Coordinates of C-alpha atoms and ligand atoms in Angstrom, one line a residue:
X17 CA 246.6 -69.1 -10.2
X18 CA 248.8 -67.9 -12.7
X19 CA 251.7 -65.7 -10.9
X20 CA 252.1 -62.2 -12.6
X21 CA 255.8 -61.1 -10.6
X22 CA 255.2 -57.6 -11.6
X23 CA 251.4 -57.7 -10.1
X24 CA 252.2 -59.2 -6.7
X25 CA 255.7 -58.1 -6.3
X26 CA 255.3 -54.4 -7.8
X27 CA 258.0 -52.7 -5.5
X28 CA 260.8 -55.0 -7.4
X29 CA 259.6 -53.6 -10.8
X30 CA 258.0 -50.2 -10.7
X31 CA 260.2 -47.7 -8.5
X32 CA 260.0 -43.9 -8.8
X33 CA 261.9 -41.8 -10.4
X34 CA 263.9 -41.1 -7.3
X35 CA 266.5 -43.2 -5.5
X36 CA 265.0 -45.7 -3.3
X37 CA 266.1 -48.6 -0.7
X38 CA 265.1 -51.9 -1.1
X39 CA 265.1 -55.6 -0.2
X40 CA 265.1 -57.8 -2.2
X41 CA 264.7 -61.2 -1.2
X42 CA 265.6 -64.7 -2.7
X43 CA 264.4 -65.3 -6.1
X44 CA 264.9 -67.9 -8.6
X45 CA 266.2 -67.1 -12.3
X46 CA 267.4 -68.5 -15.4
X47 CA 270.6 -67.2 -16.4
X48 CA 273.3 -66.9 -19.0
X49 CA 276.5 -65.2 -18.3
X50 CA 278.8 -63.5 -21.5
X51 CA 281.1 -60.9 -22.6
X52 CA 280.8 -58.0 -25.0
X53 CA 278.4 -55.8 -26.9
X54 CA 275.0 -56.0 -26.5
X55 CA 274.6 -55.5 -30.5
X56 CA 276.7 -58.3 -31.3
X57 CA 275.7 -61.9 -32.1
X58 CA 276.2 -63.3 -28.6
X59 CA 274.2 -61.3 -26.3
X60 CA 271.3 -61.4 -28.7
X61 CA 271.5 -65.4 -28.6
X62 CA 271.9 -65.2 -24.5
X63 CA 268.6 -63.5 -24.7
X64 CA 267.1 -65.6 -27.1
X65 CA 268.4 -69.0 -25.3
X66 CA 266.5 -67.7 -22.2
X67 CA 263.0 -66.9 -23.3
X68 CA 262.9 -70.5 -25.5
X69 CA 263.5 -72.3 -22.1
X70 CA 261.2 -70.2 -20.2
X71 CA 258.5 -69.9 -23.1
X72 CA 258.9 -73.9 -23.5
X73 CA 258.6 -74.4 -19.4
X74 CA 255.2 -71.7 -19.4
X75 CA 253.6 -73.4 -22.2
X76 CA 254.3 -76.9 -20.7
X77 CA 250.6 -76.6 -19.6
X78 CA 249.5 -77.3 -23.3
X79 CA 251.7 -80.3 -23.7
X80 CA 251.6 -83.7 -22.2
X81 CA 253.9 -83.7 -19.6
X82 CA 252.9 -82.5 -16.2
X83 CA 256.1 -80.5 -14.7
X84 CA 256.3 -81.4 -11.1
X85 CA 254.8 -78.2 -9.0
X86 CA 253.7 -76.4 -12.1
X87 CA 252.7 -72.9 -11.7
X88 CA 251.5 -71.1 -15.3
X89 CA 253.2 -67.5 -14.8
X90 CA 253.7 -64.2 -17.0
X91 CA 257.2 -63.8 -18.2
X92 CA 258.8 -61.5 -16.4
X93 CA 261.0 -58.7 -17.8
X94 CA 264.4 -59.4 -18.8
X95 CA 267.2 -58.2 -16.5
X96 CA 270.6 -58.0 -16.2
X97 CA 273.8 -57.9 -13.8
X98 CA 277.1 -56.0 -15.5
X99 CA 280.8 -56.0 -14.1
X100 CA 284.2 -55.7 -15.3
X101 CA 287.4 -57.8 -14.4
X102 CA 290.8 -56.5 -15.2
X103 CA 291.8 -52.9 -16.0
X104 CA 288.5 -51.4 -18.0
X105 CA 287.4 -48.1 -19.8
X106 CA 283.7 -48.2 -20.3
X107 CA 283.7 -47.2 -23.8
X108 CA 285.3 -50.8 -24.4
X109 CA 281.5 -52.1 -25.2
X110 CA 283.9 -55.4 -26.4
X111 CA 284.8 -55.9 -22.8
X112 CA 281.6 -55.3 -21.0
X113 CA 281.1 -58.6 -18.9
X114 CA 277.8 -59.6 -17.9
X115 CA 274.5 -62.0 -17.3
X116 CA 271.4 -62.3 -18.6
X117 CA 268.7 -63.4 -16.3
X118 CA 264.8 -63.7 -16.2
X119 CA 262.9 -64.9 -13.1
X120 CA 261.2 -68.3 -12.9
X121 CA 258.6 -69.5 -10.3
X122 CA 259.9 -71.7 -7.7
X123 CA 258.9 -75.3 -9.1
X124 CA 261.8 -74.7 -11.9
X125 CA 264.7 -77.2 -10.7
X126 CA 267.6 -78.6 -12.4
X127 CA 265.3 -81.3 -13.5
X128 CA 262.8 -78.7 -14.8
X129 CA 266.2 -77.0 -16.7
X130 CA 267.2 -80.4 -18.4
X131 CA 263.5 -80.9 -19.5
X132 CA 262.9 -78.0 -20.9
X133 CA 266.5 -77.6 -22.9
X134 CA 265.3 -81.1 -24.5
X135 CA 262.3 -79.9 -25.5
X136 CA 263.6 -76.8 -26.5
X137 CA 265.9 -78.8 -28.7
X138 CA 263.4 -80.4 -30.6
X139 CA 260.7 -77.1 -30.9
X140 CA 263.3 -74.8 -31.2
X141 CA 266.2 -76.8 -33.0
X142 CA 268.3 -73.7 -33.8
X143 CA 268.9 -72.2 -30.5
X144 CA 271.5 -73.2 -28.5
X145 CA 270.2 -73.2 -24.6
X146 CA 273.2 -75.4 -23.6
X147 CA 274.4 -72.0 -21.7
X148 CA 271.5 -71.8 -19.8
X149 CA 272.0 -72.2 -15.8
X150 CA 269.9 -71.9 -13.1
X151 CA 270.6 -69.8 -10.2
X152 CA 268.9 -69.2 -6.7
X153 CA 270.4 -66.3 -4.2
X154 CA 268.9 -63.2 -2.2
X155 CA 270.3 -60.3 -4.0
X156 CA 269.5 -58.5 -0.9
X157 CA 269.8 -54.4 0.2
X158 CA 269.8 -52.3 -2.8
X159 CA 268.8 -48.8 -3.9
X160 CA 267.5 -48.9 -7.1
X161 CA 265.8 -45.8 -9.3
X162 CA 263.6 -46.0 -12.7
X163 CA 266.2 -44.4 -15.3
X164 CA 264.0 -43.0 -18.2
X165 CA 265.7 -42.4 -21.2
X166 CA 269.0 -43.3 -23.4
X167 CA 271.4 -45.7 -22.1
X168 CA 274.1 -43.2 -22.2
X169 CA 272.6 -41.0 -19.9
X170 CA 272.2 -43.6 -17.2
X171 CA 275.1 -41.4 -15.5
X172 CA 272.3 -39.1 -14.1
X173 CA 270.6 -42.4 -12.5
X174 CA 273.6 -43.3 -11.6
X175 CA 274.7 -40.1 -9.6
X176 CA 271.6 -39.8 -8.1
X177 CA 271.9 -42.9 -6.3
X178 CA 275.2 -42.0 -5.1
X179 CA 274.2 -39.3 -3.9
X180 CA 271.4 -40.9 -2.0
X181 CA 273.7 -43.5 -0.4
X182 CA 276.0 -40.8 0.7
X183 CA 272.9 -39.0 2.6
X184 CA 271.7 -42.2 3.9
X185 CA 275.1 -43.3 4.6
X186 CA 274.9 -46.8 2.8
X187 CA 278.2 -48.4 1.3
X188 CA 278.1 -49.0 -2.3
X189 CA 278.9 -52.6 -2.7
X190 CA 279.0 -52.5 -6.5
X191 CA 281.1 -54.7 -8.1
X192 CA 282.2 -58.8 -9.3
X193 CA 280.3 -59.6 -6.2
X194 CA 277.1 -58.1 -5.4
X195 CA 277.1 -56.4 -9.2
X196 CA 275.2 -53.7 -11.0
X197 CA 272.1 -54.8 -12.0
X198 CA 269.3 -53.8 -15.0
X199 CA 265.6 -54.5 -15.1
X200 CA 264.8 -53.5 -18.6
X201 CA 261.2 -52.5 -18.8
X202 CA 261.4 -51.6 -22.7
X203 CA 262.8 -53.5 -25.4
X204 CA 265.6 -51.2 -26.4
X205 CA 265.2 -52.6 -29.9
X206 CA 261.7 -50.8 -30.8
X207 CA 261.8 -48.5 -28.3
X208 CA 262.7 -44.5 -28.4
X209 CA 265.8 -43.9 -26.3
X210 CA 264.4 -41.0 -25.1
X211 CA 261.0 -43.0 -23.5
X212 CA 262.6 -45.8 -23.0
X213 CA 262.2 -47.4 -18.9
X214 CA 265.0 -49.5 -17.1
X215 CA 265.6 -49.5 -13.4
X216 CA 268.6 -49.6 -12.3
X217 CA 269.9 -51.4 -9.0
X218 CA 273.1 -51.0 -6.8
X219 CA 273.7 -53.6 -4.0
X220 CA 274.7 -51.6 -0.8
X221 CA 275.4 -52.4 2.8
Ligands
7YU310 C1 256.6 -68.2 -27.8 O1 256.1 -67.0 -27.1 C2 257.0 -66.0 -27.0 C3 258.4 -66.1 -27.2 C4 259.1 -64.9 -27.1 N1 260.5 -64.5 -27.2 C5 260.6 -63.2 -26.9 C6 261.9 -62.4 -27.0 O2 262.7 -63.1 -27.3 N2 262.3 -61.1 -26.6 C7 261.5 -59.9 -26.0 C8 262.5 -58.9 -25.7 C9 263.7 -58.5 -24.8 C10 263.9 -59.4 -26.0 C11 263.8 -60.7 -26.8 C12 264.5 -61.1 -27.8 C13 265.8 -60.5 -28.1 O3 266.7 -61.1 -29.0 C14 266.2 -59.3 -27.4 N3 267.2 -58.4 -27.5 C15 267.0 -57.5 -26.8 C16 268.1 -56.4 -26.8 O4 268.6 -56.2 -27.7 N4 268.3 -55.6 -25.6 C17 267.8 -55.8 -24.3 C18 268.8 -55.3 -23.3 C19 269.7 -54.5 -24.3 C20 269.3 -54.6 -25.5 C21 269.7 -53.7 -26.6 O5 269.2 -53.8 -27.9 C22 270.8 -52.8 -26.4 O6 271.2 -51.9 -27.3 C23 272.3 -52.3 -28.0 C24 271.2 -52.7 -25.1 N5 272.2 -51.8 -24.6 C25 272.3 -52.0 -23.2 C26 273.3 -51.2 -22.4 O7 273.9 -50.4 -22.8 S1 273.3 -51.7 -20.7 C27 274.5 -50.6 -20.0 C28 271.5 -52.9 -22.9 C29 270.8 -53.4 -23.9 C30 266.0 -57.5 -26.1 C31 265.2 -58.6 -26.4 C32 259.5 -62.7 -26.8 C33 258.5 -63.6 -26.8 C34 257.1 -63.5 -26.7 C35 256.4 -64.7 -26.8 O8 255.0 -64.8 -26.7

């Protein structure tokens, strides 16, 4: 009974390396929105902030408080959406906007959120979760590829997918509203560039 995402909903996290449709449907996630580099300071605490709330809701099974609907689950991987507002060159890492998000099981409510920042606060006294949100919503029709490789060479992902959409004739919706998005597979800290797995996910219609 404990619910493995990757296991029972493979399609979402193990595409081919080849542009592919998909639906996906409404999903529940944690999530912390910022701006700028992902080496600086504040997208490293964004990251941090979410895995001590979801860490402290999993491992509420060992404590003595009973979350209402508890599910025990595997963590899933981290993801992210990434958008710009205002006139933007991409090499501008400082102005990069984006969100950091990992999914939750259902049970995980506002109420489950306020709980587990608490406790967090006590366990983990020196991260700041206060940024923390919760967020519902049905991303919806994508195409989505596994890029494999360097972040800077997500351009051939990228184009591929265009070029996909063109074929199929799908509008790229990719933007501030339905926004590029990044399932990272490898943690880009220990991993080679060059082997390193991420999918990547553009919201079309
Ligand atoms: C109590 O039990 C547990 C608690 C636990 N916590 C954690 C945990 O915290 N984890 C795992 C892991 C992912 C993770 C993290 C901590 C982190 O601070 C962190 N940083 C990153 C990171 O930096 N990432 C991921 C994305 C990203 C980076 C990165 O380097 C970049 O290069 C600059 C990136 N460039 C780009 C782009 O260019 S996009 C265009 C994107 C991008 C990843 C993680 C694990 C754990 C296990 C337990 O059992």
């Amino acid at each position: 009974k404990k619910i493995d995402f990757k296991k029972e909903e493979k399609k979402f996290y193990a595409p081919k390396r080849k542009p592919e449709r998909i639906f996906v449907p409404e999903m529940n996630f944690l999530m912390v929105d910022g701006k700028g580099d992902p080496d600086g300071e504040e997208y490293q605490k964004a990251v941090q902030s979410l895995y001590a709330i979801a860490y402290t809701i999993k491992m509420s099974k060992m404590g003595e408080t009973r979350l209402d609907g508890y599910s025990d689950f595997v963590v899933p991987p981290l993801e992210g959406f990434w958008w710009s507002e205002g006139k933007f060159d991409l090499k501008d890492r400082d102005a990069w906007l984006w969100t950091s998000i990992l999914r939750q099981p259902d049970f995980v409510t506002e109420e489950v959120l306020e709980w587990a920042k608490e406790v967090a606060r006590k366990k983990k006294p020196d991260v700041d979760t206060s940024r923390v949100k919760l967020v519902r919503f049905e991303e919806g029709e994508c195409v989505q590829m596994m890029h494999v490789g360097p972040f800077s060479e997500a351009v051939h992902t990228v184009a591929e997918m265009h070029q996909f959409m063109e074929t199929e004739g799908l509008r790229n919706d990719t933007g501030a509203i339905r926004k590029h998005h990044l399932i990272y597979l490898s943690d880009p800290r220990k991993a080679n560039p060059e082997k390193m797995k991420t999918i990547l996910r553009l919201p079309v219609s």
